[PDB]
């Protein structure tokens, strides 16, 4: 298939001790600007880092001077980490990520719901919920008898389900006058034409 | 830093005693896959992604090895300064709209070290996700729970006693 290549952790020369590594790849305009940053963490403290924007291992603390001044010597280690900007970042973006995450699209499931029981002419609150979508760009606008209502509208923050689907709930403070038609109008990059789901008075 | 997409590739985590490990691959917040270390098997969050791409768990196993190494040398280097514990917090929310007669997710943050245990007031059993990396080098972890009608218990060293979020 296609190739998910991880970076190569360069190596060093009742209690608990924690150590952590990661290779961050910051893409903008696809691959028109890649920034590679590599971080080493002992006990919640980042002590060494290779930041592509520098081009060398710089120490973040006194514990870092040994490993940074060390790894900068042997280029079998440096030039490899330096070029991980293509062997990991660029390669991974242009390769498996295209065949997967940069290709995931799931259209939202949109459902209006009247939280307090309907009592016409009494004030109530409509809840347009929008569930199960990817990526996270989405815009949810409310209409009271075909006119955008921004007043009395409160959306949540974006909600990471963590299984590659988001969630947003949008509240409308409103009041059922009979014959009125509220519509939840949802716009998403997985939608050829915007979604409109209606609730009749 | 400011960007459009952010791959968090090759996350290695180790901690002794007990040599606990984790090797993971994030891309925009969600987890692509981990490597099961005991099964020596790459386990994709999304199975569909598994059919569309591949990762060789040996790279994860080597990297975790290097990390056990570095952890040992560094544990020495500091006169053996131990890890500071961290109070964790949870928030529970449902994945789809919950309609009486139709998944419940628990979201714990400020986890550190990476050892939490996740729980009608009786024992029940779920999917748990590998730990996710924060900017402050603690972690957050998520636990799902699959019929509503008329909680979350967390046990940690930063907790004097445990806590539950009803």
């Amino acid at each position: 298939r296609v190739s998910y290549y991880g970076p190569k952790t360069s190596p060093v020369q009742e209690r608990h001790f924690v150590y952590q590594f990661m290779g961050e790849c910051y893409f903008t305009n696809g691959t028109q600007r890649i920034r590679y940053v590599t971080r080493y963490i002992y006990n919640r403290e980042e002590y060494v880092r290779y930041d592509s924007d520098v081009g060398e291992h710089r120490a973040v603390t006194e514990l870092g001077r040994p490993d940074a001044e060390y790894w900068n010597s042997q280029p079998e280690i440096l030039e490899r980490t330096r070029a991980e900007l293509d062997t990991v970042c660029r390669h991974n973006y242009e390769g498996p990520e295209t065949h997967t995450s940069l290709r995931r699209l799931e259209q939202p499931n949109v459902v209006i719901s009247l939280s307090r029981t309907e009592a016409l002419n009494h004030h109530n609150t409509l809840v347009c919920s929008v569930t199960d979508f990817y990526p996270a760009k989405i815009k949810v606008r409310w209409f009271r008898n075909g006119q955008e209502e921004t007043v009395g509208v409160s959306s949540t923050q974006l909600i990471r389900n963590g299984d590659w689907t988001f969630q947003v709930l949008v509240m409308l403070e409103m009041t059922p006058r009979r014959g009125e038609v509220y519509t939840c109008h949802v716009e998403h990059p997985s939608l050829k034409s915007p979604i409109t789901v209606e609730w009749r008075a | 830093i400011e960007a459009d997409h952010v791959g968090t590739y090759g996350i290695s985590v180790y901690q002794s005693p007990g040599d606990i490990g984790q090797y993971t691959f994030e891309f925009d917040g969600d987890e692509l896959f981990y490597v099961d270390l005991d099964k020596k098997e790459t386990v994709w969050m999304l199975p569909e992604f598994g059919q569309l791409a591949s990762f060789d768990p040996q790279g994860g196993l080597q990297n975790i090895a290097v990390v056990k190494h570095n952890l040992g040398v560094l544990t020495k280097r500091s006169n053996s300064t131990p890890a500071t514990n961290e109070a964790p917090q949870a928030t529970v929310f449902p994945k789809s709209p919950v309609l009486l007669g139709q998944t419940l997710i628990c979201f714990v943050d400020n986890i550190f070290p990476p050892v939490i245990n996740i729980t009608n007031s009786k024992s029940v059993a779920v999917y748990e996700t590998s730990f996710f990396v924060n900017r402050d080098y603690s972690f957050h972890k998520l636990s799902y729970l699959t019929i509503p009608s008329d909680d979350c218990k967390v046990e940690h060293w930063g907790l004097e006693e445990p806590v539950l979020k009803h």
Partner: T-cell receptor
Amino acid sequence: QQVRQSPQSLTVWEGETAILNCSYENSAFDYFPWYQQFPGEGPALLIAIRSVSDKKEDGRFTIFFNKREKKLSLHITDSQPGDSATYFCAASDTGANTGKLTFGHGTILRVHP
Amino acid sequence: AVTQSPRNKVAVTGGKVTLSCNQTNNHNNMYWYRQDTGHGLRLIHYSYGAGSTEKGDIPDGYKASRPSQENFSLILELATPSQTSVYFCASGDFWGDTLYFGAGTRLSVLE
């Protein structure tokens, strides 16, 4: 995946040019070491090339690498009899951070004094 | 360097046989191949560091053990004639680009 070395053994007269061949299937491969083994002994790295370059020349030996057709060729010139060995051709996808090395089956060399 | 041990062994079918390897290179990775004509070098077991072992392409019959950074070891728990061969041991560095082999062990499993 597999790596195939031809011919399974080769015989060359002193001073002639040994030409040892190798072909790998997996295009992910980017490191190509050649290990030489002398009877009674473990094998040891003779000469390696990486896919970026098309030839590493080390005095008497030269690797020729073809990325397109996925083909190698090790040239020994003016071969002395101390070159009569078995030559193995390896490849690894280094990005794979495997550890594992994939070893071709080996050509067996006879240098005719 | 890499000294394997013993370099010649003769043992019966059904009896335990323990090769051994010592590596003075401050290396981290160790490997146990066997060489056969027509099937070349084939990897059986390997190890990233003390305590872990990983299964190579032919782990059937042999169990490995890494109790030291210097010491890998094979174990033919129940020997079989099909196991008779020239066994080899190697080691290398993390992300290292060279395999440092041992000299050899000639093993004869006999009925």
